[PDB]
Motif scaffolding. Structure first.
Motif, mmCIF file in Angstrom:
data_model
loop_
_atom_site.group_PDB
_atom_site.id
_atom_site.type_symbol
_atom_site.label_atom_id
_atom_site.label_comp_id
_atom_site.label_asym_id
_atom_site.label_seq_id
_atom_site.Cartn_x
_atom_site.Cartn_y
_atom_site.Cartn_z
ATOM 1 N N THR A 61 0.758 -1.217 -0.111
ATOM 2 C CA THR A 61 -0.027 0.063 0.031
ATOM 3 C C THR A 61 1.018 1.175 0.018
ATOM 4 O O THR A 61 1.496 1.476 0.905
ATOM 5 N N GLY A 62 0.681 1.972 -1.054
ATOM 6 C CA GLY A 62 1.601 3.312 -1.223
ATOM 7 C C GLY A 62 2.816 3.023 -2.286
ATOM 8 O O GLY A 62 3.515 3.928 -2.473
ATOM 9 N N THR A 66 -1.775 2.544 -8.372
ATOM 10 C CA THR A 66 -2.869 3.254 -8.884
ATOM 11 C C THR A 66 -2.483 4.643 -9.746
ATOM 12 O O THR A 66 -3.370 4.683 -10.753
ATOM 13 N N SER A 327 -7.455 2.874 -1.683
ATOM 14 C CA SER A 327 -6.992 3.848 -2.623
ATOM 15 C C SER A 327 -7.058 5.291 -2.277
ATOM 16 O O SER A 327 -6.719 6.161 -3.231
ATOM 17 N N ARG A 372 -3.622 3.341 5.000
ATOM 18 C CA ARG A 372 -3.758 4.787 4.594
ATOM 19 C C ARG A 372 -3.017 5.751 5.374
ATOM 20 O O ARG A 372 -2.921 6.963 4.812
ATOM 21 N N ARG A 375 2.143 7.172 3.607
ATOM 22 C CA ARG A 375 2.030 7.318 2.193
ATOM 23 C C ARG A 375 2.730 8.534 1.843
ATOM 24 O O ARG A 375 3.489 8.705 0.756
HETATM 25 F F1 BEF Z 1 -2.633 -0.037 -2.410
HETATM 26 BE BE1 BEF Z 1 -2.948 1.573 -2.352
HETATM 27 F F2 BEF Z 1 -3.006 1.942 -0.837
HETATM 28 F F3 BEF Z 1 -3.946 1.858 -3.229
#
Ligand code: BEF
Ligand SMILES: Nc1ncnc2c1ncn2[C@@H]1O[C@H](COP(=O)(O)OP(=O)(O)O)[C@@H](O)[C@H]1O
Ligand SMILES: [Mg+2]
Length: 700
Positions: A61-62, A66, A327, A372, A375
């Motif tokens: 994540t990060g 995306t 996201s 979240r 980031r």
């Molecule tokens: F994996 Be990321 F927070 F979209």
């Protein structure tokens, strides 16, 4: 094509996509971008993308999935200049918009032009658009008119671990399409995938795993699970605001009522903290799905400044549901509180009702929530549960939504897409074939599908309702019975679990109350009376929780039914279904309603086996049933319409209402076509009532 080439193009003084000059904000953002983990494997992505049609991409994540991958794909199609677009599917609308704006900033273009987003009731795209962020549902809707999805050259399913039915259906459509179109690239991204499963699904698609992470997230656990998460969360938030330094807070809760209550509870505590401990100011923003967008975008507002310099730092606390679970890059967030609960959907097949229930989240969900933070700057996540519970008790992955949903509506949406065959329509976790087939023929009898298996206008309109297709057809066809509002209320009541409570101990009292709300001709009408009484007592201003408690009604399900009624009404008004009602003094006030029931429940009818017997033989198949003891109708007629079928020591039908056999031949002639109807005593009875009709109506 290669990474170094694309990077060399990115360094240009003039923007290749607009022909305007790059602001140095673009270059600062760029230098920031090239420090992201995924960048350090950009080339490794490209030569995988080049040599494979479908690719599975996993990064923490990060990592930059995306926001960087669609740009990579965009620069890879640079020398070709294809007229097709690139699509990226976020699970929520807020995510799609936020990210769209972000990438618009990163490419140094105006949002809505070269980079845009697309959501229901709002299309932020132009003819200049090359990169489009959207929700999986929106793409799923676009796929109805363009089944080949010609408008796109590459589609990137993002956060495909959620297994929402829109995502599943999209994966299946794209899997079938990938064999048809070789000019379409497909990417599947998440930080919490069951990678091997998704690879195996997409014909052993290659996997790219980016190991790096931008900033660390310091995850902490409670020494023991707290008795109540709510005030555990609030206490945690206040403890952060007091002891911990500068940084905004993010808290996950289940419902909207809980979010508001907790919001101003937090506010009331914080004000006291200000007046007694000289703590800094805290601005609390709620965030849930039913909020208006302009309030949803107030979470991005800057945290309040300290009261005066050198003093305690002011901050922003955001209390939200799980819509902010994925996201989202809310800059300024440092601390994240994770109580570990979410309002998940479950489904009751017997009563045909989908209902929400607070349940523990998945490991993927927890990791996603903690993601979240860390980031833009290092963060911390206070998980309000034992590490042992997180490692050995929490479900590893969220259970698929298709398996927790009404298959009739699902199948309706599948035929809405033009999926000609369902049993060989390869879903990742397919529902039981026979259930799907029964759903199909049941939709056929409801005139929602042709005999050919294509959408009836009725079915297409019924799909717009958040209801069991039968119930929806009943509601839609109710104005033809001159009783739209009452049927609206009844529908809303059948859209929720049983509102009557009948405890195992002392059920006499319950029966007595329900008898006080009784209507001799049908249980549906009794429901109607209950709802009317509810709205009246509410209109007085009387406490409705205690009221429901005393009259043995469920406050939760009556309230739910009410909100459902509002939403349904607004939907009807939107699509132009006229709300009409015959006066109460009218002779045919109840006959109209009872007839309107058969508009959707004609398939669930029971005929008395014989005048003396109490046993009923049901119209559907040929099963012997009894009228459920909790029924209201004093003397049930030979023909009844039932809403529930229960199986216990002996089979019962529940919530029944007396009807007339003529209504069957009138309202559903095709289903009750006595020419081809199955042999049996029911066919005989219907031929008798038929013959009587012939007699009297030939007599004139
Ligand atoms: F994996 Be990321 F927070 F979209
Ligand atoms: N709106 C924003 N403001 C500031 N920085 C952002 C914003 N959006 C993304 N970033 C930065 O870009 C990085 C990539 O984010 P993103 O692509 O959403 O990660 P992923 O998609 O892999 O979860 C983040 O780590 C964050 O630091
Ligand atoms: Mg992302």
């Amino acid at each position: 094509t290669t990474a170094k080439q694309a990077e060399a193009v990115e360094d240009s003084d003039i923007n290749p996509w607009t022909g305007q000059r790059h602001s140095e904000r673009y270059f600062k953002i760029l230098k920031a971008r090239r420090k992201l983990p995924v960048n350090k494997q950009r080339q490794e992505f490209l030569d995988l993308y080049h040599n494979n049609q479908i690719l599975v991409f996993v990064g923490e994540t990060g990592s930059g999935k995306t926001t960087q991958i669609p740009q990579y794909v965009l620069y890879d199609e640079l020398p070709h200049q294809t007229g097709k677009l690139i699509a990226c599917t976020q699970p929520r609308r807020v995510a799609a918009m936020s990210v769209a704006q972000r990438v618009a900033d990163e490419l140094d273009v105006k949002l809505g032009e070269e980079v845009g987003y697309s959501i229901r009731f709002e299309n932020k795209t132009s003819s200049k658009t090359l990169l489009k962020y959207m929700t999986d549902g929106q793409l799923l809707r676009e796929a109805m008119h363009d089944r080949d999805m010609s408008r796109y050259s590459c589609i990137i399913l993002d956060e495909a671990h959620e297994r929402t039915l829109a995502t599943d259906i999209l994966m299946a459509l794209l899997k079938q399409l990938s064999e048809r179109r070789k000019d379409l690239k497909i990417i599947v991204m998440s930080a919490t995938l069951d990678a091997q499963k998704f690879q195996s699904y997409f014909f052993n698609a290659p996997l790219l795993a980016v190991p790096g992470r931008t900033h660390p997230v310091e995850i902490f656990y409670t020494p023991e699970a707290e008795r109540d998460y709510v005030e555990a969360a609030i206490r945690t938030v206040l403890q952060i605001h007091a002891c911990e330094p500068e940084g905004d807070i993010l808290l996950f809760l289940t419902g909207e009522e809980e979010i508001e209550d907790a919001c101003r509870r937090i506010s009331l505590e914080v004000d006291e903290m200000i007046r007694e401990s000289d703590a800094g100011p805290m601005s609390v923003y709620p965030l849930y799905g039913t909020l208006p967008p302009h309030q949803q975008q107030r979470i991005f507002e800057k945290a309040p400044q300290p009261f005066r310099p050198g003093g305690r730092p002011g901050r922003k606390c955001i209390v939200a549901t799980n819509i902010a679970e994925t996201s989202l890059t809310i800059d300024g967030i440092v601390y994240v509180v994770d109580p570990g609960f979410s309002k998940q959907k479950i489904y009751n097949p017997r009563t045909r009702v989908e209902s929400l229930l607070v349940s523990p989240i998945s490991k993927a969900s927890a990791q996603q929530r903690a993601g979240r933070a860390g980031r833009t700057r290092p963060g911390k996540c206070f998980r309000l549960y034992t590490e042992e519970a997180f490692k050995k008790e929490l479900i590893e992955q969220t259970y698929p939504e298709i398996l927790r949903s009404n298959l009739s509506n699902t199948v309706l949406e599948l035929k809405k897409l033009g999926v000609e065959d369902l049993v060989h329509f390869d879903l990742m976790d397919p529902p039981a074939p026979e259930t799907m087939m029964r759903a199909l023929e049941e939709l056929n009898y409801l005139a929602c599908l042709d005999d050919d298996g294509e959408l009836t206008p009725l079915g297409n309109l019924a799909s717009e309702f958040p209801l069991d297709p039968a119930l929806a057809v009943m509601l839609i066809s109710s104005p033809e019975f001159y009783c739209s509002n009452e049927i609206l209320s009844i529908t809303s009541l059948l859209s929720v679990p049983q509102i009557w409570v009948r405890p195992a101990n002392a059920r006499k009292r319950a029966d007595e109350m329900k008898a006080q709300f009784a209507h001799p001709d049908g249980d549906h009408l009794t429901l109607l009376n209950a709802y009317h009484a509810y709205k009246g007592a509410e209109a007085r201003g009387e406490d409705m929780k205690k009221w429901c408690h005393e009259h043995f009604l469920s406050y939760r399900h009556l309230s739910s039914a009410d909100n459902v009624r509002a939403q349904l009404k607004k939907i009807m008004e939107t699509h132009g279904i006229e709300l009409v009602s015959t006066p109460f003094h009218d002779k045919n006030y109840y006959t109209n309603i009872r007839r309107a029931l058969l508009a959707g429940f004609f398939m669930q009818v029971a005929m008395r086996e014989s005048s003396n017997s109490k046993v009923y033989k049901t119209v559907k198949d040929e099963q012997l049933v009894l009228i459920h003891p909790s029924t209201t109708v004093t003397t049930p007629y030979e023909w009844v319409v039932y809403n529930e079928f229960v199986l216990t020591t002996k089979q019962y039908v529940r919530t029944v209402t007396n009807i007339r056999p003529e209504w069957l031949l009138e309202i559903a002639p095709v289903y009750y076509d006595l020419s081809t109807f199955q042999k049996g005593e029911i066919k005989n009875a219907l031929t008798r009532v038929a013959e009587k009709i012939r007699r009297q109506q030939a007599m004139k």
